[PDB]
């Protein structure tokens, strides 16, 4: 399907590693869809070149440029920089439907069945489960929606200073409307929940389709022993999957640009 | 409405305080429904007498007795004692529909509109939000359902050793079926979330209808200064509401049995 895409975002090189692992994981699980990544000019040439290989489409978004539609909102609400960049996912009108996935997620299984879903479909956020988590969502690119989101960003901002507040505000019927727009939690499994509610993880986590690495320590912030194939220090399985992909697929890819 | 009830449970005197505050809070917000409390013989005469005043119905459940239907399951799965006692809420066939509320919840607003809901309606659990939280739920008393729950308890137990695992297992279509069976989070607002996702609380928590005091430190485990009208040590508003009711309504009630 050429009209549908997984879309991620990286604003820097550290999250490009995430993007690259995410993109690799989607190919690993044989997505039939396109892979698109939003990048900023802060993403270096080497990461960018690796992104051009992993992703079918690399889109540059520069909200620091006055030519950007979001730039005015950025001036007004500088804290929303990343949010505003992410919102450009709606500008990808070459696609009829996309699954947005943050660069700190990881695909463990084919999730092409998400394209059955409508905008706005997302998994509940743990913590405040009447908000959906904005790490993974099904949306329809539309200039109009983009404009409407930008407008909300400008007028109200984000109740949480991030994209999740803004998205929840805009798509506010999610909690109370249409159970199909609740993606199963396994499609955006918060890495925190994999110890916060451990009995639940043991009961339902073997079914995890997507892991969302939350907390301040991102996967790339870990040390990974390539001999023991495990990250160093508490349930590292997913970190280890991430690092296996990073070591197996991403690093050698990055390395070939040295020549 | 004489055929509908809020139903809580107390297995001991500490949770009877919770029950009493919960029952008082429901009257404070002018429920038109009956108030029922499941008690065990471990609840002392004084708490029991206070329960007889706050609640319209005080039901004694003694799963330690061989005459109890749950007793055999208790022998088999001793960890489920409290769960099995709670399951007797389904035995309350004098009511057509009930809202079960754990004794560690607190009503902040009339929630009689829960009786519009069907079994099984519950709020999402934070942590694993594709489970519902068993602190507050709308159910239909039925010997059959009780028997079926007991049977599941016996055969599979609880994936989390508590009632929530068992209830989620039995009512397992909740995550993926019927958005109306998702109670808004404000009807079972986890006290943890009131700091775990603080931006969300600031955005949506003023709407809280029910607070669910989770964590090991229950409201009665706090020290309350009756002069400053505040608990001692981090967002104590709800603790303070609980203690205000406890101080204002429950304690003087308890005291009158000294004579
Ligand atoms: Cl629905």
Curated annotation (Swiss-Prot), chains A, B:
N-acetylthreonine modified-residue sites: 2
Site feature: Important for catalytic activity: 86
Binding site for Mn(2+): 102, 104, 212
Involved pathway(s): Glycan biosynthesis; glycogen biosynthesis
Residues the record marks as carrying a glycan: 195
Group of enzyme by EC: transferase
Positions with a binding annotation for UDP-alpha-D-glucose: 9, 11-12, 15, 77, 86, 102-104, 133-134, 160, 163-164, 215, 218
Any one annotated GO CC term: cytoplasm
Residue numbers bearing the Phosphoserine modification: 44
Localization of this protein: Cytoplasm; Nucleus
Main location: cytoplasm
Reactions accelerated catalytically: L-tyrosyl-[glycogenin] + UDP-alpha-D-glucose = alpha-D-glucosyl-L-tyrosyl-[glycogenin] + UDP + H(+); [1,4-alpha-D-glucosyl](n)-L-tyrosyl-[glycogenin] + UDP-alpha-D-glucose = [1,4-alpha-D-glucosyl](n+1)-L-tyrosyl-[glycogenin] + UDP + H(+)
One example GO MF annotation: protein homodimerization activity
GO biological process: glycogen biosynthetic process
Outcome following mutation: residue 195 to F/T: Loss of self-glucosylation. No loss of catalytic activity
Annotated disulfide bonds: none
Cofactor dependency: Mn(2+)
Enzyme Commission number(s): 2.4.1.186
Tissue: Detected in heart, skeletal muscle, brain and testis, and at lower levels in kidney.
CC cofactor note: Divalent metal ions. Required for self-glucosylation. Manganese is the most effective.
Binding site for UDP: 9, 11-12, 15, 77, 102-104, 212, 215, 218
The organism's place on the tree of life at top rank: Eukaryota
Quaternary state and interactors: Part of the GYS1-GYG1 complex, a heterooctamer composed of a tetramer of GYS1 and 2 dimers of GYG1, where each GYS1 protomer binds to one GYG1 subunit (via GYG1 C-terminus); the GYS1 tetramer may dissociate from GYG1 dimers to continue glycogen polymerization on its own. May also form a heterooctamer complex with GYS2 (via GYG1 C-terminus).
Family membership noted in the UniProt record: Belongs to the glycosyltransferase 8 family. Glycogenin subfamily.
General function of this protein: Glycogenin participates in the glycogen biosynthetic process along with glycogen synthase and glycogen branching enzyme. It catalyzes the formation of a short alpha (1,4)-glucosyl chain covalently attached via a glucose 1-O-tyrosyl linkage to internal tyrosine residues and these chains act as primers for the elongation reaction catalyzed by glycogen synthase.
Protein name per the record: Glycogenin-1
UniProt source species: Oryctolagus cuniculus (Rabbit)
Lineage per the UniProt record: Eukaryota, Metazoa, Chordata, Craniata, Vertebrata
Name of the gene this protein is made from: GYG1
